[PDB]
């Protein structure tokens, strides 16, 4: 699968349909 390819907490590389909200992403480059 490709969902193990990003899982939205390692690379994701998105925004809305990524790993949830930026602040709510516990990531985003540290906002």
mmCIF file of C-alpha atoms in Angstrom:
data_model
loop_
_atom_site.group_PDB
_atom_site.id
_atom_site.type_symbol
_atom_site.label_atom_id
_atom_site.label_comp_id
_atom_site.label_asym_id
_atom_site.label_seq_id
_atom_site.Cartn_x
_atom_site.Cartn_y
_atom_site.Cartn_z
ATOM 1 C CA UNK A 1 0.000 0.000 0.000
ATOM 2 C CA UNK A 2 0.930 3.688 -0.172
ATOM 3 C CA UNK A 3 -0.672 4.644 3.081
ATOM 4 C CA UNK A 4 2.280 3.157 4.753
ATOM 5 C CA UNK A 5 4.194 5.271 2.439
ATOM 6 C CA UNK A 6 3.267 8.425 4.291
ATOM 7 C CA UNK A 7 0.692 7.609 6.977
ATOM 8 C CA UNK A 8 0.508 11.397 7.354
ATOM 9 C CA UNK A 9 3.193 11.540 10.044
ATOM 10 C CA UNK A 10 6.533 10.906 8.331
ATOM 11 C CA UNK A 11 6.452 12.515 4.881
ATOM 12 C CA UNK A 12 2.803 13.067 4.023
ATOM 13 C CA UNK A 13 3.689 16.134 2.022
ATOM 14 C CA UNK A 14 0.273 17.764 2.021
ATOM 15 C CA UNK A 15 -2.089 19.939 4.022
ATOM 16 C CA UNK A 16 -5.890 19.434 4.056
ATOM 17 C CA UNK A 17 -6.127 15.901 2.905
ATOM 18 C CA UNK A 18 -2.831 15.183 4.546
ATOM 19 C CA UNK A 19 -2.246 14.760 8.218
ATOM 20 C CA UNK A 20 -5.049 16.943 9.562
ATOM 21 C CA UNK A 21 -4.570 20.598 10.522
ATOM 22 C CA UNK A 22 -1.046 22.041 10.797
ATOM 23 C CA UNK A 23 -1.375 22.892 14.528
ATOM 24 C CA UNK A 24 -3.326 19.784 14.845
ATOM 25 C CA UNK A 25 -0.625 17.928 12.905
ATOM 26 C CA UNK A 26 1.983 17.754 15.680
ATOM 27 C CA UNK A 27 4.320 18.598 12.809
ATOM 28 C CA UNK A 28 4.402 20.947 9.836
ATOM 29 C CA UNK A 29 8.067 21.763 10.384
ATOM 30 C CA UNK A 30 7.073 22.976 13.856
ATOM 31 C CA UNK A 31 4.618 25.323 12.353
#
